[model samples]
Each structure stands twice: as C-alpha cells, then as structure tokens.
Target: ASIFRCRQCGQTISRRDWLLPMGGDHEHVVFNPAGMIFRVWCFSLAQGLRLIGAPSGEFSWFKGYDWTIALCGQCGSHLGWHYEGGSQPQTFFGLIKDRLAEGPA
Candidate 1:
C-alpha cells in the first residue's frame, strides 16, 4: 500500500486509508476564505494528524460540516482540516494534495 507523508518534514500521515467521496467525488478543487486554492482529497482516516482549534461551520465549502485546522501529528505542518458536525459518516479528513507526498508505505 502507499503512504501519505508530510511534504515538508517527511512524517508519515496516512497509510492504506481509503479516499472518501464528497460532493460525488473523491477529490475536490476549492479555494479558502483567503482565496488560496487547494486540491484536496477526502480521507476516511489519517492516523497521523493533529487538529487545532474548535471546528467552525461558517463559510465551509461542504455545506453541513464544520472544520478545524489539521497539522502533521509529528511535525506540525499544516496539512488540511478535520471535518465534522454534519450528515452520514459524521467526520473525516480533507487533506491538501500538495502538502503530502504519496509513495510506497
């Protein structure tokens, strides 16, 4: 299986996790409130993540979910965010594709 690691620090974040579907797709192209665009993948589980701050629902791209900043559990680099407070499968990780290195586990 392949692994996803922090691009900046090489800390392994996800190993063998399935990409979850969102808005009918597994990957999404979206922009943040700051106008920074990111290509993200919805992951069912990311074992090596550290979430910071309370989740916020305002301006969320995913209509029903709230989110909190997600960092690399080992290196603390910004990776994406943990999404929650909505419908089925209440929570998941939305990780930035450019922030991770995917390769052999």
Candidate 2:
C-alpha cells in the first residue's frame, strides 16, 4: 500500500491506525459529506483530529454537523478540516490532494 501525509510537513496521515484507506482521484474532485463534493480526498473521523478554529455549527456547517480547519495529528501542520453532516458515513476529514505525497508505506 501507499501513504497519504500532511501537506506542510511529512506526517503520516494514514497508516491504518485510526484511519480508513480513503483515496480517490476522480479528476481532482472529492467528496465531503458536510461541504460540497470537491477536493481530492477525505477520511471519516470523530476525534484524533485537531481543528484550527472553533465551530459555530451554523454558517459553514449546520445542526448535527461541523466544519473547521484540521491540523496534522502528528506534526501539527495544516492538513485539512473535520466535517460532519446528518448522513451515514458522516464526519470526515477533507484532506487536500496537495497534502499527500506518493511513496511506499
């Protein structure tokens, strides 16, 4: 298998620890249950992820959902955002494509 890491620094975002293998190109278009179907990748999670700002659960997100910038769980670098919505398989990390570098895991 390969690896997906933090954008700013070399942090292993997915090592099969608390994350599921979430990888899809789809022409640079990704899916986040909370926001629009964009970006390049995402990983479902409720914790073990840090946010940049506090969530109001109103503007960018809504009831039962939240949105905030996510930082690398290891190196503390800006990785993506933690999102949530009233849907199955909700609450995911909309990690950017540019954040990941190709290499052996």
Candidate 3:
C-alpha cells in the first residue's frame, strides 16, 4: 500500500489514509501571511505528527476551522497543521505537499 512519508526523516506520516474533500476539492493551494504558497491536501489522519501550541481560527484556510502547528513526530520537522471544528473525521491534518513523499511502504 502507499503511504505518505516525512521528507526529512522518511517517517511514515499517514499510512493508507484517504484524502478529505474540502471546498469542492481534495487538494488546495494556499498562501500564508508571508506569501509562502503551500499546496496542501486534507488527509483523514497524520499519525506521525506531534501537535503544538493552541489552535487558532485566525487566517484559517477552512472557515470556522481551528489549526495548530504539526511537526514530525520523529525529527520535529515542520510538516503542516492539524485542523479541527469539523464533524467529518472529527479532525484532520492539512499536510504540505512539499514536505511529504508518497510511495509504497
């Protein structure tokens, strides 16, 4: 099966996980306040992450959703953010496309 891995440590982040459709799509292109663009995908889970800080709704990509920084569980690399405030999946991770590699486990 295919799994998504952390680019820095090769740690499996989401194994055999499915994507979540948001805003009529499963993938989205977003930019931060600094103009850094991120091609992200909403996944059902990212088990290899450690969430930090308090969740915030300010500048949230998904309206009404709160997010917190998510790092690599093994190497502490910044992977993306974990999101809440949705009924589906209870919660989910919006993983950065550039920070992950998808391949066979």
Candidate 4:
C-alpha cells in the first residue's frame, strides 16, 4: 500500500476511523453523521482524510459498514473518513459540521 501523507502535517491518516470519500475524490465534501466537511483520500479498500467529524462521537454507522479516519489539518482537526453503504457500488454522502447522525433504521 502506498503511503498517504497529510497535506499539513505530512502524517498518515490510515486508521479505521478515517474514511475515504465514496466517489474516490480528494476534495473536501459534505459527509453525513456529523455533517462535517472532510478531506478525502482513496486507497485500495480504505480511505483517508484530514478533517470531517468530531474526534469524540460526531459520526455513526447505521445499516452498512461505515468507518471513520480522523486527522489533523492546517488549522485544527477534522474527520477524514465517512464510509457508508455496503459492498459493490456504494453511495457517498458528504456533509459539513452542522449535520446530524441519523443512520438508516
């Protein structure tokens, strides 16, 4: 696996909490859970990010297998990953820091 370096800290945000964007994009997108804006990075199966959700419990997973990868940015910290849905073509939902964590029931 290639090393994913942070833009600010040059650190790798390779963790289960970090998530790659759903569409394989590295731009900041609005994700669900905490509705936070997260910087996305795509890998083989896992994803990476610089900021997205809260470090505590700003996000969650409902029906599918969603994980998060938190990382530090230039300014502060943010949620990196926001994996949702299941296998196959999954849907990526982006959000800012004002969204809620209402998972599928």
For this target, which candidate reaches the highest lDDT against the unseen true structure?
1
Query: lDDT of all the models against the reference?
Result: 0.87, 0.56, 0.86, 0.40
TM-score of each: 0.92, 0.57, 0.91, 0.32
Give per-residue CA lDDT, model 4, range 58-93, as digits (tens): 344324546554444443445344455556445342
- After TM-score superposition, the amount by which residue 96's alpha carbon in candidate 3 deviates from its true location, in angstroms, is 0.3
> By lDDT, is 1 or 4 better?
1
2 or 4, which is superior by lDDT? 2
RMSD of 4: 11.1
- Alpha-carbon deviation at 94 in model 2, angstroms: 0.3
The per-candidate count of clashes, in order, stands at 0, 0, 0, 19
Mind giving the per-residue lDDT tens digits that candidate 2 earns over 1-105?
A: 466656566666654233434333222364456765645455554233467777546554224667787777667866666776645546666566566664666
Residue pairs with colliding backbones in model 1 are: none
> What ranking emerges by TM-score with the best candidate at the front?
1, 3, 2, 4
- The lowest-lDDT stretch of 10 consecutive residues in candidate 3 is 15-24
Q: Candidate 1: RMSD over Cα atoms?
A: 1.4
Backbone clashes in candidate 3 total: 0
Judge candidate 1 at residue 62 and give its lDDT: 88
